[model samples]
Target: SLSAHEIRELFLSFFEKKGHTRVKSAPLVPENDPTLLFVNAGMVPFKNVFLGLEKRPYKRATSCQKCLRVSGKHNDLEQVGYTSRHHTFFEMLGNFSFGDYFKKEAIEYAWEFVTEVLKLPKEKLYVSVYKDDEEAYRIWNEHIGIPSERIWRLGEEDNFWQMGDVGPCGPSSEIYVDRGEEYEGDERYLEIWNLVFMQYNRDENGVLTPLPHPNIDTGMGLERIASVLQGKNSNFEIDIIFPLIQFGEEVSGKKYGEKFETDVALRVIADHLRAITFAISDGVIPSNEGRGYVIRRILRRAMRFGYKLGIENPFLYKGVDLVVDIMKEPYPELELSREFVKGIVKGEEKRFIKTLKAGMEYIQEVIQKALEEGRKTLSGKEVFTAYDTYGFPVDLIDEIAREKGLGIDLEGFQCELEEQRERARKHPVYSHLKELGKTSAFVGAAAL
Candidate 1:
């Protein structure tokens, strides 16, 4: 019965005991990689080392990396509410070898960590490797003594691991734990530990040269494993995240398991809160474009959920203290900028609440008018204006319409958006750069 915090500590300590440097978790916002908007995986910090462009004093390293998986290639934020396993913000427990170790020892350490350290049930756990990667298969079957049937040979889509199209590419092996049948969950396996052996380096011309000393990149999902360790089906029930869900329950006066919609809202709010806290701690702010816009969309989405679930005032900022208290130990940077993080969350929440409040009423009226007119759908002009004038996202409107037992006239909305875009071609303005004192140009864009 270990908490999520204890699991993270144990993973780092286990790797450290195995002669690895316990590197502090990198910031959610990647400091060195310009190509990425946010650090999306544990291996991200070591890409330069994997490419042989950067060197560290130590040969092996371990870390609990904070990751944000939204937008661009890894964008899956829409899965937050419905899927218990998906998250916009999650911590990846990883151990790396800078040409220090290969598949054998890497697999040995991971097996030991799960079997000896965490003590997960052995029979329920299973394995998978790249279809043609017999080296990895041999290690699991012969050296590790796992049965051949237990080891699945998945194709390129499932077994192949690549950082990008070019650069370091290799086969991957994964360890999955079956959650067991009983809750419509037969064969419900969760892949907790993933080991990526950097065996080859792919070139621009699609050639992979076997490196002299291949590197090791390993990542274990902290949230995914926490669920299995705690014997819970959903990740939101884990220690680090459940507290935020309780915070949502407190603010909204709704129980987590009371209803499907409420449960989804609580889950999403908690997800966005973690994303907001970490993103702001790393110097990101809510604005109209790029990274700033992403954070802005996240906050507003959470706010809309809260508004739907019985909240009217600002409450997201209140969770900042609780989140900081929970996460500060592993990430001391969170404690360093505690007040500032809370401030940004509060400021953004307040600004968004105003716009959200006004736009919500407008949407309600539109829905009512449509119902009274015997029309089962809201006009596209109304939906587009809600976004154009009040700055509400279309999905928010779509959600509201469904809840009202009505549909949206998407054709009209799409038509209005094109007209707005065509007109905006004549008036180009950088609304995100409105941090400079006053700009009348920024006015009339958002109601609040």
Candidate 2:
């Protein structure tokens, strides 16, 4: 089985041989780009070059970038643990061109790497391109010799690539591996690589202007490819993640593959631990807003799942070493901050466990009250209180309620949340001044 580490190396080397400079992966936290919180894509570091703002010594580059997809346009946090493919943190193996190569070479390089270097079965491979992009269609079908029937013509939503509303934008050709006929369409045709032909620049007003020299940006997920090469059905079974799962099994004293719920919880813990460890290593912390809140949510969610496995105490901190041990070689920062990251995780887990315990007790009381009052639904006010005061996630509350054959007042909870948001929007000074305005403050200010 080709491990993820080996695949990362092979990918960078292959691109290097093609005259692409092997650049080191950028930090997870973005430096200058205020538009992004985390480096979500391999192309992000090269955005200035794409927009003609900055220049590089080399025209082509390759790196296995550390990417986080938990927020903004690329969110996959809710989808994690439930799906085999989605993850909060994953490595993106990409080969980039700054006004050097275009579609034909990009297609050839991806095809050659997957078919020759990896030796994946050619028959199981399929390609998809933008509905309007015939040039990409010709390259995939005629240049690459992929059969017409195997190349699918998908719309912009499926095939087009854009950095955002405005920037380097173009048609994309996605390569998919057919798992089997049973899992057809999206379920089976697993997208392994995406080659984007950046031929035009979209202005802020949504005007499309042709760039003097087009660029090429392609990304293939290391976890997905590792899963394929290792003959594993799910990414969780791959070398990078499976070891973590095994660790979870060991810590929880429960065997995986024995029960579906237990297995999902195991995967959640494994995946969240890596994200939390790496994120904290990058200097993110548990807070109540933005990136910090996202990290806290992920940690607490993992702890909630851990609770299902009967892990009532702070246990996620123990799994940090496993993650650091696996990722230290590639991400040396993790090694340097290993103990620090663990300390942060242990602190957050300890605090969250207290909140979780309290929330559980409160929920039990709420359910008991509902039963006594002949009510089928728990009060949204109480649910919101648990969330606002105790940091209990609504989904966790919903899950617990479902087990008791009760429903929550979801609309009421949402209303209360919106009201709190409105209150927050009203600044304290402004509110106090407005109240004082009802008397003499406004009249005295007008006279002044």
Candidate 3:
């Protein structure tokens, strides 16, 4: 198998050989863009190409663009804490066709990369086409040597990529790598490379309007493929994450790969710190409103993972460099803004520590009150207040209260959690159009 650098270089060189120009990354969208709070993909800059908002530099181009899709319309936030594959800030290695090509050529190139250059086993690969996407499915089965059964048909929810109501909207087909016997029982074992055919536009009436120029946009997660290539237990075990593990060890005094939870947490801090640092470097700050809150949550969550692993010092501040080192080749901006990034991370880390201390004190106060009441249990609402208002962890409150000879109302705490989530889901910024009102005006207005 090819090494990490070889894999990246090979893809770029292959596309370059095919007449695609290499370009520097674009800036994340400022507060000005109505459609995006932050840039979300290598394709985002090329939106101009797709929308005819700006001229295409070339008929074809390749780029490893820096993207931030952490919150608002493109929020990949909920998936971060749970998945090994998703990221808040990521490098999207992309090849674009500004009405220059169609499905057949795109499919052929992807197959060539996987089968010939990467040489992945044919038996271990799967493809999922958008339902009724005959062109995509046909290319995979007939030309790519993918068997019919090995190809799955997915719905729009899984097979489509749309920026919003307007612009390029289209059916997609995704290529998946099977991890073989180890993943046989796990349904989520598939690694996807989403290939979108951006030909349709959603009109004001919510009808699909076929675009004049159909484009090809594809994204394959580098870390995901690296894991499959290296035969690592998790993507975090890839070389890109090894340096992160070392930093985690230095700060936590706990070696990774020894414990399941610790290894996972190491992966999380490594992955998340990169996101947080880059977000801040790109001008996002930790705050309670909007995208800032998500950034703050990611940073705090990374810190909590370190704290849970027994790390006591400010490791995230010191560890931002590792992120830059790993990503320097594709995104030198990490290195360009090193000092500023570090300063922001340190400041955020310091704020989190202060919050933690205050939270602990509040937990102590709650425990003290429970003891004074001569009750052996802390009320669930008090625990919720400690979390929602005072920023104390519910579990931390429970643990401390337990040590003070008090029990926690688990059911009550869960109820409060559900209620708070419901409230969040009701917010106009958080809810989908259908959830908020009579119609999805945001989609129509933004399209115009």
Candidate 4:
């Protein structure tokens, strides 16, 4: 297994061998671009290359790109805590082409980096291509020496890639890690890296037209590979995150590897703090809507969990410095932005504390009201109201009910969670699009 430093240096060195110049990542924009709300992919910079809005003198370039996939096209936060991989704010290691390279070179470089450079076993690797992406499939089998059986040809839903309902679109060939033999049956570990062969455009008429210039856009999650190389079971266990987890231990007075609840609480606090700090550092402020609301939700959930873990001090704000210390090396701006991050963390923590107090009072009031009505239980709808209106967790109400000699509808709360998931699925950003469009379209579109 590679140490964190080894993995970092190996990435930079791999791109250098491909004649790719290293460039700095752009700032994480808090506002939406006319094209997108957040930078979902590393290829964002090369958008101009495909649109013919800019010129590229180099054939290849590499950078660590800041990406936010919290909304629209690729919002994937639902998979984060529940799964071993996936993050709302994560680093994407990217290599690009400005119409200078094609399918053969890209496939060779990816295989070389993952197998020869990173030293992940070649036997544990798999490649997925667009069903009609005949050229990419042939390269993997012929030039890269991958087996035909290992090279799975998927339809447009899985193989083809697109920028949006409208924009540069094409078929993409993806490289997947089979993880270890231990992960053989778990499909979640079959992680994929999208290598978009930006060669075509979909017009407003929904027709596919070949772009004048083809470009290469590739993204490998920094955390995912770091988890694999560090011999850690999950990205949250990486060295970059250990300090934050330790801080949570210190705050909660719970040692690492304590009970499952305590450990999860600590991990949640640690992970959420870094995410919230980075979000605020990048100009996201606490609000009641959209990305800001997601930020607030994350912080509040962590803060409430801290309370559950028997914490009382202003510990969440202290995590801001921990985050800055760990991340400042790669993102030096964190040093300059520490004050702003600290202030936001402090303010949000305080606000959440007040909300907790208010919510506890309101929950007790509901129980008292139930008792006065000669009822032994509070309705599940009432608990939902406390959650939706009074900013209290329904689970907290159930816990309160058990302790305070009241009954609450546990079944109904589960129903509520299920209903919320169902609603989210109805308008998903990561859905049957992957199921139905895996062929020539997903992997075939150019960046334009």
Candidate 5:
């Protein structure tokens, strides 16, 4: 059986043989695209080319992009640890055509790769095409030899793939592997590949115009395919991710499959460590704004889970090594920044642990006060204070409140958070400038 790592390599190699230039994975942090906190797709680095702003020497390209989807358009952080398919950080294996090919060849290439190269069962395979995309329908049914009944004609919501509100937009064809009757039909028909035909450019006015040169953008979830290939239901059970899960088990002194909640926690820890290690390596720090804030929130969420597993000390940092070690080969950058990455993780772990300890006591006091006041719910003001002042996460507060059989003022908490944000915006910090504005006492007197 091919390991997840092997599958990634195979996909890249297969694409390479198909005349696609093997482009190295771009950094998770995009360059000069303030619109995005991090790169969320394989085609992101090639956005300019799709827009005709820049040109590459090769017409075909392939990469296993390092993607983060915790925010903005591709946000999937909330789905992590619960879904079999989603991840905050995952590799998108993609093959691109600048202007060389369209639906037929692209569909054929994907078909050969999935059925012949990867050896997925043909009878168990399914496909989805845009409702009116008869070209894609023909390619799958005739060119690829899939049965007409097996190909589903889905609406734009399902079969269309777009980057955002405006830019390169197109109808898409998705390939799914039938996991069997136990999966309950399409619900269990695991989608492994998506072929986006970037034939139109949607303007800000919401009008779609045909482009002179249509492009091909195909993406496959490396982890999802790995799960199918390895015959596992959960992606965390795969080789690339399971080692980290095992490391989590060791760190927390808990079995992974012992309890549902614990298993979810273990998965969360493993997944977050990967995201943290990669994001930090790519120069994102744990702070209170932008990309830094995202990393901070993820780290704190993992820490809350660690607390659930009775891991009070700074232990997530220990798992960084296993992640780095496991990923160092394909991502040489991890090996290069091994010590630096581990150091940052350990430092943050220490800082968070100290902060969390203080915050817990503070929260307990707040909860007790609410109870003494004959209140059934913990006020959102108190929850937001714990978050804003103590750097505590709200979810942790919710968990604690649930344990005490108390409700939380969630709406109030949002209001408080918004008020603080508005204040920060209205009163921009300029203390340093103010200090600079003040002259020395003698000089000030003389100038006056």
Candidate 6:
């Protein structure tokens, strides 16, 4: 079986051999782009080129983009542990054409690579064109020799590509691998590649104008292809990611396939470890808001999953070595910041663990009271009290209460939260404190 490393190298080299420059992957943290918090797709780095705002020497280029999809239209945070293909962080392998190639070459190159290079079974592969795009249909059906029955003509939602409400837009063609009959009509039939034929510009007047030179932007998820090549159902089961799950198995002593909950915990830990390691090594520090807060939330989510597996301490930091080891070849920059990332992870873990302990004690007391009163529900006021006193988010409170077979007052907790924010807004002292915290670095240990 081809490993992820080989596949990434092969895919990049395949494009490079076809007159494309192999550009390096951009950092997950985007560069001076206010529109996005992280590089959400391979096309993001080349966005300016696509929009005619910037230029590069080569007309065609390729890169394995470091991507984070926890927000926006591509948000996959909540689906990570429960699904096979969802990931908080993943690499998008893309071959781009800055007005160099359009539909014919894009489809031709992809078909040649899949059928001849990768040697995926031709009959097991299916494709889709934007329902109205006749030329693309002709290219796939007539030129590519793929049968008409297998070519699905989908609508704008599934087959259209756009950067935003306006800008360079196009009808996309997607390639899917048929897993088996058992997963027929299910999400298990993986959509491995998205080939975007950018031919028009969406003007502010909601008009579609033909661009001077139509560009091509295509992205294939590296992890998704690895799953197919390795004959695995889940992206986490790929060789590069499975070791992290194995590490979880070692630390929690919980076999991965033992139970659904245990497996989710393992999957979450595995997935978040990559995101945390990459985010931190790229120079993000855990803090109160924005990018830092997103990373912090991911770390805390992984920590809570660990907490479910009887790991009540700073266990997430221990996975850094494996992350660095697994990712160093593709991203050697991780070598320089290993200790720094670990320190940040460990510090955040310590703070969260401390808060978790205090919050756990308070919740246990609340649950005991409920049991004494023969009540199976927890007051939102008590949940809010724990939040104010120990800084537990609603989700964490939900997990704790559920563990004890009790329900919480979500409406009550929301009311208390709304009031807390309302008071913070109107109170002069609270507004000053907010600015103070913003300008000043932590005077002592950080307040988690």
Worst 10 residues of 1 by lDDT: 434-443
Please give each candidate's TM-score: 0.89, 0.88, 0.79, 0.78, 0.89, 0.89
Model 3: lowest-lDDT 10 consecutive positions: 439-448
Ranking by lDDT: 6, 1, 2, 5, 4, 3
- Residue 320 of model 6, lDDT score: 94
Task: Summarize candidate 4's per-residue lDDT along 1-448 as a digit string, tens digits.
Answer: 7755566667767898889988777656634364454677777876776676777667678888878776666876444444555566778888888877877888888888888888889887888898898899889998888999788888998878776677787888887777666765534345647888877888888899887777788888887787877777777788787787788878878886757667767777876787787788888777654456667666776786688788875678888998888888888899999988898889877766876767767778888888888888877577666666556544445556655688776555445544544565785123232232221111111100
Residue 81 lDDT in candidate 2: 80
Q: Write the per-residue lDDT of candidate 3 for residues 1-448, one digit (tens) a residue.
A: 5656667777788888888887666766553675466777778777776777778558888876667666567776545534566666666667888888889988888888888878888888888888879888888888877899899888999788786866568998888887766565333456547788987988777788778788899887666677777776566667877788788877888887687777767877887887877787778776654556556667776876677687766679888888878777766778988878888878878866766656766777878877887877877677777666656444445555765788777666656555665665686234433232211112111111
Clashes by residue pair, model 6: none
Residue-level lDDT for 305 in candidate 5: 80
List residue ranges in candidate 3 displaced over 4 A.
29-35, 185-189, 258-260, 361-448
Q: For residue 160, what is the lDDT in candidate 5?
A: 87
Task: Mark the 10 consecutive residues where model 2 has the least summed lDDT.
Answer: 439-448
Which structure is stronger by TM-score: 2 or 6?
6
Residue lDDT tens for model 6, 200-267: 88989989988899999999999999999899988999999999999999999889987998998999
lDDT of 1 by residue, 280-313 (tens): 8889977765577678878888999999897999
RMSD of each: 4.6, 6.7, 7.3, 9.3, 7.1, 4.3
The number of residue pairs in model 1 that clash at the backbone is: 0
lDDT of 4 at 444: 10
In terms of TM-score, how similar is model 2 to the real structure?
Answer: 0.88
lDDT of 2 by residue, 181-205 (tens): 7775665888999899998889999
Residue clash pairs of candidate 2: none
lDDT of 2: 0.83
> Model 4, residue 323: what's the lDDT?
85
